[PDB]
Every structure is written in structure tokens, then in C-alpha cells.
Amino acid sequence: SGTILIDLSPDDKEFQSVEEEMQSTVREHRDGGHAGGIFNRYNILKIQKVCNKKLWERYTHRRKEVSEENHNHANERMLFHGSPFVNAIIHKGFDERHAYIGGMFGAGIYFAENSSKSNQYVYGIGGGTGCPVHKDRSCYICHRQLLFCRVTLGKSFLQFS
Amino acid sequence: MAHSPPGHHSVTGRPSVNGLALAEYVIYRGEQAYPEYLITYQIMRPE
Ligand SMILES: CC(C)(C)c1ccc(-c2nc3c(NC(=O)[C@@H](O)CO)cccc3c(=O)[nH]2)cc1
Numbered sequence: 001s002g003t004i005l006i007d008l009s010p011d012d013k014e015f016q017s018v019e020e021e022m023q024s025t026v027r028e029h030r031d032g033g034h035a036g037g038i039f040n041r042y043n044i045l046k047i048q049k050v051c052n053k054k055l056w057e058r059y060t061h062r063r064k065e066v067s068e069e070n071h072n073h074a075n076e077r078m079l080f081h082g083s084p085f086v087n088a089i090i091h092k093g094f095d096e097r098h099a100y101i102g103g104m105f106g107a108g109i110y111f112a113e114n115s116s117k118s119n120q121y122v123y124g125i126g127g128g129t130g131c132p133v134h135k136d137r138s139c140y141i142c143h144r145q146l147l148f149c150r151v152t153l154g155k156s157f158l159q160f161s
Numbered sequence: 162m163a164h165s166p167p168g169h170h171s172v173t174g175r176p177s178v179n180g181l182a183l184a185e186y187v188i189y190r191g192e193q194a195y196p197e198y199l200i201t202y203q204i205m206r207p208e
């Protein structure tokens with residue numbers, strides 16, 4: 001695949017800033033916890049850096065195209081993405097298989113500023129049937145994974161909702 | 162996979178109702194995101 005995962009130490013400034021963004025963007029959800037569980041905070045177990053030369057160069061090439069179409073402004077953000085396909089994403093990169101055809105804003109790939117919003121999709125649409133072991137959308141035992149991603153928004157269409 | 166609105170590169174979903182909710186975003190080219198950090202975690206039961 002070409003991907004390697006570098007485990008970060010909890011003492012690393014880069015671990016601590018990523019943990020902080022994870023924890024500070026939790027919110028309550030209108031479903032009372034139905035899809036993603038009931039919680040105000042996480043226990044962070046590991047943070048790994050994803051390194052893949054081809055995928056990085058594919059990203060920066062598109063970033064430059066977007067930037068030149070938008071007064072030299074990629075409008076780059078760091079956002080969360082939860083999906084049952086995280087393991088494929090990190091090795092193969094994002095593509096149309098990771099888009100939600102039936103999503104509110106069209107057949108695209110969805111990202112969130114609230115880490116707790118992405119947590120609702122770790123086990124699939126609406127939390128699916130919850131964790132594989134216990135079939136529990138609010139499982140406090142089983143380990144979950146999210147991605148913290150670098151995303152190019154360019155000129156973004158504003159949708160009020 | 163669909164197209165961006167003409168002349169745009171993404172969509173911002175603005176939480177017009179929920180006071181505390183932050184924005185959500187959609188892209189239509191997978192080359193517009195790179196997965197930088199893989200975070201392993203548990204949610205925690207409130208006390
Ligand atoms: C189908 C498939 C590939 C398993 C899949 C489907 C959805 C997701 C996802 N959605 C998200 C989302 N979606 C919405 O607001 C829409 O659902 C509104 O219609 C909003 C914010 C974040 C996410 C997120 O982090 N992930 C991931 C994978």
C-alpha cells in the first residue's frame with residue numbers, strides 16, 4: 001500500500017494538540033446518544049501519523065489546482081471522519097467508495113468539526129448495529145477509530161440547515 | 162460520486178437550528194482530503 005503508521009508518544013506536542021481537538025469538540029446530539037453513544041469525553045488510547053508518499057502528492061497536487069481557482073486560497077481545514085472503512089482509507093486513500101450516495105448534500109465524502117458527529121458513523125449510517133462484539137452503539141469497551149484529516153474546501157457552497 | 166455545485170469545490174452545511182453544533186462539510190473528489198492522524202479511543206461513560 002505504501003502507508004506506514006508512526007505511533008506518537010503522549011508526551012509529543014503533536015499528540016497533545018490532536019487529543020485536545022478530539023476532546024474539545026464533543027457535543028450532545030439531538031438523538032440523545034442513539035447513534036454514537038452517551039459520553040462527554042473520550043479515553044484516547046493511541047494516535048498514529050499516517051504517512052504515504054503517493055497519497056500525499058495526490059492531495060497537494062489537487063490542493064494547488066483548487067488554490068489557483070480560488071485566489072490562491074486552498075481553504076484547508078483539519079476535520080474528522082468516522083467510517084467503517086477507515087482501514088481502507090488509510091492504505092488506498094479516499095475515493096467514491098467512501099462517499100455517502102444518500103447524504104443530505106449529495107453523493108460526497110462527509111467530514112465534521114465535531115468529533116462526536118463523526119463518532120456516529122464509526123459503525124456505519126446512524127451507528128449501524130453498534131460494535132461488532134456487543135452490537136452496542138454505546139459500547140464503552142470496544143475500541144473505536146476516527147480519522148483527523150487535512151481537507152481542501154476551496155470555494156465552499158454555503159447550505160443553511 | 163456527484164459533482165460540486167458549479168463554481169465551487171465543496172459544500173458547507175451550516176447548523177442553522179442547533180445552537181451548539183459545528184459545521185459539517187462535503188467534498189466530491191477524494192483527492193481533496195488526506196487522512197493525517199488515526200485516533201484509537203473509547204467513549205467514556207458519564208459519572
Ligand atoms: C456510507 C458510508 C461510506 C459507510 C459512510 C457514510 C457517512 C459517513 C460520515 N458521515 C458524516 C456526516 N454525514 C451526514 O451528515 C450525512 O449522513 C447526512 O445525510 C456528517 C459529518 C461527519 C461524517 C462522518 O465522519 N462520516 C462515513 C461513511
Ligand SMILES: [Zn+2]
Nearest residue numbers: 131134139142
Ligand atoms: Zn463492544
